[PDB]
Amino acid sequence: PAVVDHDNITVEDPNRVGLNAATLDCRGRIYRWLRRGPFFQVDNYFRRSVKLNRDGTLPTDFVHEAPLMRKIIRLAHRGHLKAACEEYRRVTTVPPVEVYRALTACCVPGAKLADAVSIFEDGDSKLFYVSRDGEVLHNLMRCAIAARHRARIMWVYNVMRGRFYENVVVRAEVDLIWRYRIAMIALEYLLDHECAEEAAAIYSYLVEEELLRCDVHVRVGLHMREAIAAGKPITLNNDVMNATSLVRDATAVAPEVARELQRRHAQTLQNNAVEAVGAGSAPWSILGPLTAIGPTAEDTMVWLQQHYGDVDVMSIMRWARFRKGKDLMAKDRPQYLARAAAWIELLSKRNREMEEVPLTYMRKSKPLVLDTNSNVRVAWQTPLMRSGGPPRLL
Amino acid sequence: QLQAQDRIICGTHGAGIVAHQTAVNSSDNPMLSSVTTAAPAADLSRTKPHEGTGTSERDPYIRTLHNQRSAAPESSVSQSHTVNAPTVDECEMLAERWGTMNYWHNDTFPRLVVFLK
Amino acid sequence: PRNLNHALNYGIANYAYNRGNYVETQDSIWEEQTASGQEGWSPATHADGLR
Amino acid sequence: AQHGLYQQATPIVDELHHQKALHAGHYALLINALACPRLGQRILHCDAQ
Amino acid sequence: TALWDATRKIRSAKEAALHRSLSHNTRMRASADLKHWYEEDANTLRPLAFEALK
Amino acid sequence: VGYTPVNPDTSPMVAYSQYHWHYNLPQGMERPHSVNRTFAAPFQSNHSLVNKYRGVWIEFDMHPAFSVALEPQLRKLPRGRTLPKTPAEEVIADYTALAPLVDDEKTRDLWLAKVFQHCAFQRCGGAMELWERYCHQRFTAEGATAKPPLSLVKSVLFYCNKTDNSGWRALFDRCLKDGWNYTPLFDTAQWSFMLKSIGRMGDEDGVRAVLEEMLDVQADLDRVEARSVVIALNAVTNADVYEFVKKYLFNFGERKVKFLRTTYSDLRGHGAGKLRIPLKENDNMYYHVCWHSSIRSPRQFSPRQLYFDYTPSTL
Amino acid sequence: WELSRDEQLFWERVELIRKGQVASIGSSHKRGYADEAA
Amino acid sequence: THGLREKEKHDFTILQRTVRIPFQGYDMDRFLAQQKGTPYGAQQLPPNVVPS
Amino acid sequence: MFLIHFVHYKTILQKYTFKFKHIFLSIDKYNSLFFNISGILIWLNIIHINIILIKYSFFILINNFEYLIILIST
Amino acid sequence: CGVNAYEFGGKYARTYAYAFEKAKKELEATAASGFMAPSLSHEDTERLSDQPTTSPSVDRFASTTHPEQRKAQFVPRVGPGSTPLEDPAADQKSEWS
Amino acid sequence: YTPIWKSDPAVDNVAPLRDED
Amino acid sequence: SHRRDYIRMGYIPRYTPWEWIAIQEADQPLIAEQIRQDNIGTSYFFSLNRYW
Amino acid sequence: LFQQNAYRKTPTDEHWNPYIRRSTENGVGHLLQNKFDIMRREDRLSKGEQDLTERNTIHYGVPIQQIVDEFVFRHRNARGERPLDYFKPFPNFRALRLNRMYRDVEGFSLMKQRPEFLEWELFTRYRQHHQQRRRLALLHGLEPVANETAQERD
Amino acid sequence: HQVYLKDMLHLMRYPEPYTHIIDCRTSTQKMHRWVPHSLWLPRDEVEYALQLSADEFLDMYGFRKPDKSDDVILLSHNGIYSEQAGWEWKKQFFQHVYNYRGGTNELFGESYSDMNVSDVLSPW
Amino acid sequence: EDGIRGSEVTYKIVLEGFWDHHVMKLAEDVCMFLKDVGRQIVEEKLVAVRRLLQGGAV
Amino acid sequence: TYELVMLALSLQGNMVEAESILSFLRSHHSEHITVESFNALLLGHREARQFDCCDAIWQELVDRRWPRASPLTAELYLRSIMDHANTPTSEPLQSFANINVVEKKKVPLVLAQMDELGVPRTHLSRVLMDEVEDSLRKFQTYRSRFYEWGRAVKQFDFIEFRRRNGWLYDLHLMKCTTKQVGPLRDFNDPDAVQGAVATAEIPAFFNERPAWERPPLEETLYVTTNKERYDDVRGGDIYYDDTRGLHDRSPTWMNEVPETRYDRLYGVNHPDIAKIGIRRHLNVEYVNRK
Amino acid sequence: MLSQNVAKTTVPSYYMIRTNLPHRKPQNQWEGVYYYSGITKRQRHLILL
Ligand SMILES: O=c1ccn([C@@H]2O[C@H](COP(=O)(O)OP(=O)(O)OP(=O)(O)O)[C@@H](O)[C@H]2O)c(=O)[nH]1
Ligand SMILES: [Mg+2]
């Protein structure tokens, strides 16, 4: 099989790789050349070199091109995006994942979404999915956040869950911890801007992957790292997890959250009942679906459990803690309260069912006995609307 | 707009112009010389959805009527520029309603007069 | 009962209108085909025979 | 109830209503539970495809 | 009336059993029969009421 | 008329003739054609797939608690599609040191699978002890009930295959129906490496067992890489196993068989260098391979070569 | 049980049939098939 | 199998060549009804049968 | 042993009917348009013209395959 | 006393019992499979040893390799739309609702 | 070119079963 | 399909029949790039400079 | 009989094919799976509606256009059923169609079935009267309103 | 349609009522054993046998003529004669007709031939 | 703009034959086709629009 | 309450009423409407098997982008698509191919909409994702593949795959049509000599001798091969149909077969088969049925 | 062997040279492009399992 030396090319052509016009046996070759696909030269040059290693290792590390990648990264870090791309163009071999991490991370501050997305899309399926990574994805999601693009948040998330092809066949799939983080800033955003649907989707995925308790697992994981550093034994127990400051603090705030839920709900009931009449008080607010809380800690956890208990409330109170690096529980109490309240309100189907507005009751009808219009119908009338009238069936 | 359009175009299998009451019996006409008297129809029999045993109109030799849902075409009458008679439920909410100047001062059923009354 | 007016056409189908009156019958039809949306105010075409 | 044993739930509920320990939203909770939607899952996924 | 409610519940239960059975069985679904669904009902299935004593 | 045939698409005198459609007829479509709908052909490229993992996926399930805690040690081990070059001795020393400190069976075992894999990539021979030091007691020794995590099995097996070793035969046998039954869950890659190593060390009987097992477990035969099957069938000199290998050779596909012949003929051929250890000459097997190939492929008719010596008789 | 019974029954019928053949044909020989030449 | 069914259908098609479209009346309700003998004074007596 | 003698019931009912056309009902044929041929010109070595029916010809075919032929009002 | 009339009497008794035990076993599979019964064609099972001698999966045709001979009847019947009936391709068989 | 491989040994498949029974 | 005079007796459809359209349409795949959906924006910096 | 079932193991043998599966020819019995659908089918057959399972085979019948075409083909232009205006120079597209009765004749009982002498002309004059009524109506703005009750109609 | 060895053993241990195994062996000389639940219709007689009415048939072969819906398995030494008899069972239209290949030889370990035909062709 | 003069999306199909009447008749066919497909689609969008007009949230 | 009632009516398959309810809600109460209503109607139409309304409601729900569609919604509409796509027509339309498969071609469009709406495609039943993935693999392709998909090699390989599975019938290069159909004869003239204006390959089920003219089922009772004459034919057709009866035998058959115990029944119309039959010697009582 | 493998060429001779009869079928315009859409027995098995 022919191979082209790009160093050694001579007029003499020792290897006999060139296409000769007049030699014996040249004909079918010449035809073969004129029959070639549109990308033939380029595609074959690209695939004959640049292929996945027998190990499962990317081609990504090559000596001659390394200083270039160093330059790209170093440029992206000082925040020159265009410069970095102008050098990206000059790259002959697949660049390492670090390149893409740098480029997208550079893309985040200025909010450019489109360029980040096209970077990542350049790394997917073209280049063997060097660009499928936790960190890169993470940057993409944070970009979608900056630019307030809902559909693109969902798009990024959808990419990160991945497909049978990229998951099983390629074996390029994001790390567990990273999936947690991405999904979590997405959920943060959605629940803050009151998007019920996509919040419900992402939350349902968290539920499904057993990721509800995860932040705890990471905290516990660091303490256990220092404990292995000192040489002591470590284990995963419920007592070890409920010893964490996170869990303890959440448990401490629980009754306050529940009281806030109660107040908010009561006042929503009030509003609905007043709008029902178009403004006194309607009967709608007299007795609502929420039961009064007993005066205790256990009564609180139980109450939350039975009324709001389709969601896991403890984990949501954990997530609602930090905002933009600021700790809400230890600085602003009421803001944290209204936030955990809002999030539990949004993520639960039960609360949604009980917070609804009273609607008027639709009349059934029969068509006229003497026809004039097809559009004019005889409406059924409830016993309430006509007192008197003969005794009638349903 | 035919007379009894459904009973005939939609409800009858032939669009009315195929005569289903016909005997397949042998005829003495010169051109009908190919016609052979038919055996009576198969008694307990399960047909293909596009056919029949040819007994009656209710059961033709070839079924024309589709078995799907039938929906008459969507009116080309303007729903927007037409103004109907005011309903009750419209007159309750009349204070929140947004009309065209043609809707308030409309020649038949002006809504402004009602709104003020 | 839906047959109250039957006497007006005996044995022939029930009608809610006078079927001996030409004008009123045609008017009934008019109103029907109006309510069904076969008849009504529609943006004109060049071919509709404006004259 | 949710797991699809209503039979074992009936005596308990009867006895609860007896002592007047049940209140407004609680009945909602129970009647809603009678739809077995922890069974809803096993059916949805396995059987109904 | 109450007894009727109870009986109705019982027959309902028997039939529900049959229904789960027929819906989940492939080899019986193989022969295409509506009859399978009607060839056993609250009359035919067990427990039989007139057999209760023994 | 000439030595150059009229191309019937361009030529009006063809197109517009009585045996085709003249231009004054109404130019519609004659009949519909559903080709791709009636019978559909599955996709097999002549080129192998570009993005496939090509190696043995070791299935890292670790709890995201220890996976944070053990990160400084793990980072030296392989993650997905990443193969750090850290010296094997160091990693084994790390596990030997820290692993008794952690209480989980799952975590320790997953960790160990990763160690084995990392050592299998550098071909270090002193790994097998870790099997006899920790694991052998509760899994392969004296009918111990415990059933090993699949990751571990796959990893150790890949190590025995990469570093040529006898120990594999004890593990493999434990994975059949009556034992742990991990056999249906193996990657195609696994079987490839297995057959390759086994064929290198030259066990006809190991080969027969493994091919039997692959055929039964419904592995993907034609997508088992050619190199490994050729090496494995190369090592077979015994009469019985030879019979078995004809009868088994029929279990492959037409294409696969042609490129088995081709792979074989290249491997003792020009491509002899492609191998780390050169092949050993098996003439009967190589021949029977080329023969199977000549049989299963379609026959071309070359009358001058067949009937070259024929003569008519008036008998 | 029934396997045994049916066995003897079988060889019985085989017997009778075979005797029928030899009797009617007259001989124990039979033709080949025109395809059994080759 | 002998295809007499198919021949029956085709022959029906042949017979169709002759027939007219029926006259359904100017007032079609009235006509249909009169045909069935419902309206007033439209009642016809059964054809008199010679006793056997 | 044998307790009884019985009459052998069977359900032979065919009630479902499945026919599947053999593959050769849908196989292709060559169909042609057929007009009355008004005339013919043939030419290979020597041009020969037949004329069946003399009329203004509405249509003309030309075919080159071996002999040149012109089928007039074909 | 008349068992020898029925299918579960005599020589076929052993068959009946066989079936019976299979059923039990089979039921357990359906209990494990989520009450969606496994394939009647036994395409679900992992091992070739698994599929019973009874299953329709076992390929009984005149010839294994030569496709002309794999027909059920004398000529090769086609499905609606002139789609091949006799030996279905993998994508022709659809299990959908 | 036939036979391809050695035909199966004379083994009787019927006997073992009937012996068990 | 039911028309037995189709090419033989001289009936050649002036309008290609619905069924046939449905089939020809059903046979070939639809290019994915023909859908034309852009919700992001134009990529100013990177897009034109992408891998060679 | 051989043709129907040769090696056939079960009636559904070919039902791996989704298109043979839902064919309703033999009956609907194999497309009923769960009790629920069978109750439903029972219900809707008692209400005189169509059975939803029968909709498994989509049957587009022959369109009306095709029917009329076949009719007027079998009749070699069917001159019996044409309006006389069809035989005069340049008939408009309304004269191009068959003899169907429209809705305009529905209120006139003077002409019974056979209209006597001058009846038809009289009727035609009534018809024109109504067309002018419609014109006056649209003119001064009193026409049917799709919504209207009977008092407003009155 | 072929019937494999497994099917045959399974049909020895657990037989079906209306499944009939049938012996095609031509010469009484060479048949030294009995196939479980089998019945003897020799190949040479098949063409006549199938032309019989059920009564005439019962009379001649001493067992019931299988219906056309029932499974009929054919058996011989090589499988050759069982195949020719198979075509015969097919022509009279029988719905399930199966042929065990190398049947009695695989069963009983006997090496025999229904007919003598040899692989080698005589040089033209 | 109203009526004919204006639209959201304009498609132009340029048909090309070797013979004039070919492309003419072709144009008639394709045109009839797009008349029916066109009616279908636009009708559906119309019922959607009418629903939307009848009421809905923001 | 209302979305529950809608769901009830829908499960019943009663659309008229369900949509009436949605209409009421649209008119008066609109600002409260959730997605589960459109889910109700969707599922409903899917039951009644009206797929154009199933389409109408998805398109409408895409236009108004509120309330947001749910992955359940897309599950419903997509399911509906596959359902429509898998239904057969009646026999008149079944001649050439199964039509309704075109509805699957709808999918890669719908999928695209899911991206624009922010409905993640990875929330779909595994079942449906298989079905839809198969739909994609049927009709979708990229620019890349499309530049290369007509390579002669690929075409011919497809031809070959068809060759190994023995379906050559529909392929272009690989079929050779033989049979011609002759003209119809007019009573208006025998004299007229017809000739061919044009020629087209069309399936034989258009014109083939009517079922009542031809012998009964020819597929089963007659083995027919269309074949070429080996001799030179001076005139006439170079392809003839070789037909033989399935049950055809040599006139000499009795002799080419070994003699049987029947032979002495020769030329006898009503034999006593009980007499030469073995049952009479075999049975002790032997009741003869005749 | 396979009966649909049928000679596409006439016996080699001077009729090929001295006549205007073309050597191949003309391309069929309405024949779709053969492309690969489908699965294996192996793949179906995998999915079901
Ligand atoms: O099919 C192939 C093709 C190519 N190679 C390439 O040939 C080199 C040496 O070829 P070998 O295949 O002889 O080495 P090996 O078995 O020890 O390699 P591993 O599989 O253990 O990695 C391998 O290291 C790889 O680079 C294969 O191993 N297999
Ligand atoms: Mg030169």
3-state secondary structure chain A: CCCCCCCCCCCCCCCCCCCCCCCCCHHHHHHHHHCCCCCCHHHHHHHHCCCCCCCCCCCCCCCCCHHHHHHHHHHHHCCCHHHHHHHHCCCCCCCCHHHHHHHHHHHCCCCCCHHHHHHHHHHCCCCCCCCCCHHHHHHHHHHHHHCCCHHHHHHHHHHHHCCHHHHHHCCCCCCHHHHHHHHHHHHHHHHHCCCHHHHHHHHHHHHHCCCCCHHHHHHHHHHHHHHHHHCCCECCCHHHHCCCHHHHHHHHHHHHHHHHHHHHHHHHHHHHHHHHHCCCCCHHHCCCCCCCCCCCHHHHHHHHHHHHCCCCHHHHHHHCCEECCEECCCCCHHHHHHHHHHHHHHHCHHHHHHCCCCCCCCCCEEECCCCCCCCCEEECCCCCCCCCCCCCCC
- d(CA A332, CA F118) in angstroms, rounded, equals 50
- Are the C-beta atoms of residues F252 and F226 closer than 8 Å to each other? no
**Amino acid at position P64, single letter:** R
Q: Which residue of D has its CA nearest to J97?
A: D49
- Are the C-beta atoms of residues M33 and E24 closer than 8 Å to each other? no
Which residue shows structure tokens 């990024």?
A156
Distances (CA, A) of G5 to A45, A223, F22, G11: 80, 82, 81, 10
* Nearest CA distance, L45 vs chain P (angstrom): 24
- Are the C-beta atoms of residues F35 and L27 closer than 8 Å to each other? yes
In chain P, residues with a C-beta closer than 8 Å to the C-beta of F297 are none
Tokens of J17: 């019992």
Burial of A316 (0-12, 13-18, 19+ CB in 10 A): buried
* Nearest CA distance, P215 vs chain O (angstrom): 42
Tokens of P59: 């398109």
Cis peptide before K3 (omega within 30 of 0): yes
The answer to whether I74 contacts F18, with C-beta atoms less than 8 Å apart, is yes
Q: Would you say how long chain A is, in residues?
A: 394
∠ Cα F258 F261 F262 (to 5°) = 85
Whether residue A52 lies within 8 A of chain L, CB to CB, comes out as no
Within 10 Å of residue F312's Cβ, how many Cβ atoms? 6
P211 in helix, strand or coil?
coil
Q: What is the DSSP letter of F182?
A: -
φ, ψ (nearest 5 deg) of residue P53:
-80, -35
P241 in helix, strand or coil?
strand
Chains in contact with D, where contact means 3 or more Cβ–Cβ distances below 8 Å, are A, J
Q: Which residues, listed in sequence order, are joined to residue N98 by a DSSP beta bridge?
A: N73
Nearest to D1 by CA among D12, D17, A307: D12
- d(CA B84, CA B108) in angstroms, rounded, equals 9
Nearest to A376 by CA among M143, C34, B74, B3: C34
Whether residue F5 lies within 8 A of chain Q, CB to CB, comes out as yes
Q: Which residue of C has its CA nearest to A371?
A: C16
The answer to whether J85 contacts M23, with C-beta atoms less than 8 Å apart, is no
∠ Cα A273 A274 A277 (to 5°) = 95
Query: DSSP assignment of F124-144, as one string?
Result: -GGGTHHIIIIITTTTTSTT-
In chain F, residues with a C-beta closer than 8 Å to the C-beta of P93 are none
Tokens of A44: 């074959």
Nearest to A202 by CA among A343, A53, A54, A78: A343
Nearest to I22 among J2, J4, J75 (CB): J75
The answer to whether P174 contacts Q34, with C-beta atoms less than 8 Å apart, is no
- Are the C-beta atoms of residues F56 and A210 closer than 8 Å to each other? no
Tokens of H8: 């029956």
- d(CA H16, CA B22) in angstroms, rounded, equals 8
- d(CA P136, CA P129) in angstroms, rounded, equals 10
- Are the C-beta atoms of residues J90 and F40 closer than 8 Å to each other? no
- Are the C-beta atoms of residues A97 and A133 closer than 8 Å to each other? yes
- Are the C-beta atoms of residues P222 and P245 closer than 8 Å to each other? yes
- A32 Cα–ligand 2 center, Å: 19
Nearest to O58 by CA among P62, A194, P64: P64
Half-sphere exposure of N55 toward its Cβ, with a 13 Å CA cutoff?
10
- Are the C-beta atoms of residues N63 and N39 closer than 8 Å to each other? yes
φ, ψ (nearest 5 deg) of residue M35:
-50, -50
F255 annotated binding-site participant: no
In chain P, residues with a C-beta closer than 8 Å to the C-beta of O49 are 63
Which ligand 1 atom lies nearest to the CA of residue F193? 20
Three-class SS string for chain E?
CHHHHHHHHHHHHHHHHHHHHHHHCHHHHHCCCCHHHHCCCCCCCCCCHHHCCC
- Are the C-beta atoms of residues P262 and N48 closer than 8 Å to each other? yes
Residues contacting A71, CB < 8 A, separation 6+: A87
Q: What is the DSSP letter of M97?
A: S
Q: Residue ranges of the alpha helices (H) in N79-122?
A: 80-91, 103-108
Whether residue L11 lies within 8 A of chain P, CB to CB, comes out as no
Nearest to M11 among I16, I19, I20 (CB): I16
- d(CA P159, CA P177) in angstroms, rounded, equals 17
Nearest to D26 among A288, A291, A354 (CB): A291
Q: Which residues, listed in sequence order, are joined to residue F82 by a DSSP beta bridge?
A: F79
Rg (Cα) of chain D, in Å, rounded? 13
Chains in contact with C, where contact means 3 or more Cβ–Cβ distances below 8 Å, are A, B, H, M
Residues contacting N116, CB < 8 A, separation 6+: G36
Please state whether A64 falls in left (phi above 0), alpha (psi between -120 and 50) or beta.
Answer: alpha
- Are the C-beta atoms of residues A57 and F81 closer than 8 Å to each other? yes
The answer to whether P26 contacts O54, with C-beta atoms less than 8 Å apart, is yes
F258 annotated binding-site participant: no
The verdict on the CB of residue F227 being under 6 Å from ligand 1 is: yes
- d(CA I14, CA M1) in angstroms, rounded, equals 9
Residues contacting D21, CB < 8 A, separation 6+: none
In chain P, residues with a C-beta closer than 8 Å to the C-beta of J89 are 165
**Residues N82-96: b if buried by 16+ CB within 10 A, e if exposed:** bbbbbebbbeebbbb
- Are the C-beta atoms of residues A68 and A96 closer than 8 Å to each other? no
**Which residue, by CA, sits nearest to atom 3 of ligand 1?**
F227
Which ligand 1 atom lies nearest to the CA of residue F275? 13
Which residue shows structure tokens 């006799």?
J86
- d(CA B35, CA B42) in angstroms, rounded, equals 20
Q: What is the DSSP letter of B73?
A: P
**Which residue, by CA, sits nearest to atom 11 of ligand 1?**
F275
- F193 Cα–ligand 1 center, Å: 10
- d(CA F33, CA L26) in angstroms, rounded, equals 10
Straight-line distance from the first to the last Cα atom of chain M, in angstroms, rounded to the nearest whole number: 71
Q: Which residue of F has its CA nearest to A127?
A: F51
- d(CA O34, CA L16) in angstroms, rounded, equals 13
Q: What is the DSSP letter of J4?
A: G
Please state whether D36 falls in left (phi above 0), alpha (psi between -120 and 50) or beta.
Answer: left
Pocket test for ligand 1, best of F227, F231, F264, F268 (most atoms within 8 A of CB): F227
P122 in helix, strand or coil?
coil
- Are the C-beta atoms of residues N32 and G9 closer than 8 Å to each other? no
Which residue shows structure tokens 């949230």?
O57
Whether residue J83 lies within 8 A of chain I, CB to CB, comes out as no
Residues with their C more than 2.5 Å from the N of the next written residue in chain A, i.e. before a break, are: 279
Report strand pairing: I39-43 vs I48-51: antiparallel
The verdict on the CB of residue F268 being under 6 Å from ligand 1 is: no
Residue window 29-48, chain C: list those with CB within 8 Å of chain M: 29-31, 34-35, 37, 39-40
Q: Which ligand is nearest to the CA of F123?
A: 1
Q: Which residue of Q has its CA nearest to P155?
A: Q34
- F297 Cα–ligand 1 center, Å: 29
In chain P, residues with a C-beta closer than 8 Å to the C-beta of B70 are none
Q: Which residues, listed in sequence order, are joined to residue A323 by a DSSP beta bridge?
A: A326
**Amino acid at position L47, single letter:** S
- d(CA P224, CA J75) in angstroms, rounded, equals 10
Tokens of F189: 């890659």
- d(CA F267, CA L24) in angstroms, rounded, equals 49
Resolution in A: 3.4
Which ligand 1 atom lies nearest to the CA of residue A55? 22
Residue window 21-50, chain J: list those with CB within 8 Å of chain I: none
**Which residue, by CA, sits nearest to atom 13 of ligand 1?**
F275
- d(CA F152, CA D3) in angstroms, rounded, equals 37
Pocket test for ligand 1, best of F121, F164, F276 (most atoms within 8 A of CB): F276
- d(CA I38, CA C31) in angstroms, rounded, equals 64
F276 annotated binding-site participant: yes
- Are the C-beta atoms of residues C4 and A343 closer than 8 Å to each other? no
- d(CA A89, CA A92) in angstroms, rounded, equals 9
- d(CA F288, CA F291) in angstroms, rounded, equals 5
Distances (CA, A) of N110 to F66, N81, N95: 67, 16, 31
- Are the C-beta atoms of residues F54 and P231 closer than 8 Å to each other? no
Whether residue B80 lies within 8 A of chain C, CB to CB, comes out as no
